[PDB]
Every structure is written in C-alpha cells, then in structure tokens.
Design an enzyme around this catalytic site. Structure first.
Site, PDB file in Angstrom:
ATOM      1  N   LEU A 160       7.106   1.733  -2.109  1.00 19.89           N
ATOM      2  CA  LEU A 160       7.291   0.298  -2.163  1.00 19.89           C
ATOM      3  C   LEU A 160       6.510  -0.309  -3.323  1.00 19.89           C
ATOM      4  O   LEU A 160       6.950  -1.234  -4.047  1.00 19.89           O
ATOM      5  CB  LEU A 160       6.935  -0.301  -0.816  1.00 19.89           C
ATOM      6  N   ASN A 161       5.325   0.237  -3.569  1.00 21.46           N
ATOM      7  CA  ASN A 161       4.591  -0.163  -4.765  1.00 21.46           C
ATOM      8  C   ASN A 161       5.313   0.122  -6.063  1.00 21.46           C
ATOM      9  O   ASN A 161       5.311  -0.762  -6.997  1.00 21.46           O
ATOM     10  CB  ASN A 161       3.167   0.468  -4.745  1.00 21.46           C
ATOM     11  N   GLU A 174       0.864  -1.216   0.000  1.00 22.03           N
ATOM     12  CA  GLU A 174       0.000   0.000   0.000  1.00 22.03           C
ATOM     13  C   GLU A 174       0.883   1.243   0.000  1.00 22.03           C
ATOM     14  O   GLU A 174       0.497   2.283  -0.508  1.00 22.03           O
ATOM     15  CB  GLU A 174      -0.939  -0.059   1.180  1.00 22.03           C
ATOM     16  N   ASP A 175       2.129   1.134   0.493  1.00 22.33           N
ATOM     17  CA  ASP A 175       3.026   2.275   0.512  1.00 22.33           C
ATOM     18  C   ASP A 175       3.427   2.596  -0.895  1.00 22.33           C
ATOM     19  O   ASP A 175       3.797   1.726  -1.652  1.00 22.33           O
ATOM     20  CB  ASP A 175       4.295   1.919   1.312  1.00 22.33           C
ATOM     21  N   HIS A 176       3.300   3.862  -1.303  1.00 22.92           N
ATOM     22  CA  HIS A 176       3.548   4.236  -2.701  1.00 22.92           C
ATOM     23  C   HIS A 176       4.961   3.935  -3.211  1.00 22.92           C
ATOM     24  O   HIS A 176       5.135   3.452  -4.323  1.00 22.92           O
ATOM     25  CB  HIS A 176       3.186   5.727  -2.910  1.00 22.92           C
TER      26      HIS A 176
END
Ligand SMILES: [Mg+2]
EC number: 3.2.2.-
Length: 140
Positions: free
Chosen positions: A126-127, A122-124
DNA sequence: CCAGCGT
DNA sequence: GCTGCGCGCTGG
DNA sequence: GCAGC
C-alpha cells in the site's frame, strides 16, 4: 474519485466501487499471499455477493470455503461479524468495525474515498501505491 | 526436501 | 508490548 | 493483519 491503476496491480484498484468487497479483500490478505487469496475471493464473492448475505451465513460454512488460505475459523467469524456491523452499526471509517484495522482503513481511505493525501500506510504494498500516487498525481 | 513467508 | 491464528507458496 | 490480552 477514481483511484488510478498502478504498475503494482493492487486488487483494491478493481474493487473500490464496492467498499464491502474491498474491505473483504483486505481481510483475505491478512497474512496470506495475493497469489492464493485473490482466486479464492472470487469464489467467496460468487457465493456471498453482499454484506446482506454474509451477515446471515454460518461461519462454519464460510470456514470450509477458506480452508486452503489458513486462518479459516478466525476469518470466517470475522467476515460474518464485520458484515453485520458494516450494515447495522453507525460508522464513518471502517476501522470502527470488527476485523478491519489500519491496513483496511488505509485502503478504504485511499481507494473508496478521496483521502489519499492524508494516509500514511505501514503496509509495504500500500505504501508503494501511495508513494507512486504522490510521484505521479500531476501527470494523472 | 524444508524453514520462512504472505498487501 | 506479545500471541494465536494456519494454509500453501516460495525457492535455496 | 487483526483482536485479544
Ligand atoms: Mg476495527
């Protein structure tokens, strides 16, 4: 498993050999920009090189080093308790530990073990890394 | 200067 | 589901 | 981002 270096330069890319340091870095990034958090991380790691040291530390001393990052008492207490649990509790994934949630857990599962294909961040940032891996893993 | 943000 | 935690950075 | 609520 060696997670690849990316054009996004996530700090996890350099810390993955030591899961405790990678996890500590995730905590440093809780509502705190990398621009500020990461230079303080190196100061912290010089002083508290391992979970073994951090678990014996007085949280008030840790908080002094973290002041400029904000969330300094919360995070100091977290770091000491997390460090204690990391070493003393049975765990399979670090979300089982105090102070690590889905973001830290997802980071661990992409970087420290080879479970990146099962992770849905969900972390941008990391995405962005995880999408890039799907797009590029064959080439790599 | 200053309201909103940061893996 | 929402709140407390907290600084300096960012940049109009 | 995370735990506590
Ligand atoms: Mg946890």
């Amino acid at each position: 498993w060696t997670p690849p270096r990316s054009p996004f330069n996530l700090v996890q890319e350099t810390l993955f050999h030591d899961p405790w340091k990678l996890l500590i870095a995730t905590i440093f990034l809780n509502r705190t920009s990398g621009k500020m958090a990461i230079p303080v991380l190196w100061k912290f790691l010089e002083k508290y090189p391992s979970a073994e040291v951090a678990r014996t530390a007085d949280w008030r001393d840790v908080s002094e080093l973290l002041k400029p990052l904000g969330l300094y008492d919360l995070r100091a207490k977290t770091i000491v308790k997390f460090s204690d649990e990391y070493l003393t509790k049975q765990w399979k994934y670090p979300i089982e530990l105090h102070g690590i949630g889905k973001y830290g857990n997802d980071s661990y599962r992409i970087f420290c073990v080879n479970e990146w294909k099962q992770v849905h961040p969900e972390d941008h940032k990391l995405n962005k890394y995880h999408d890039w891996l799907w797009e590029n893993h064959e080439k790599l």
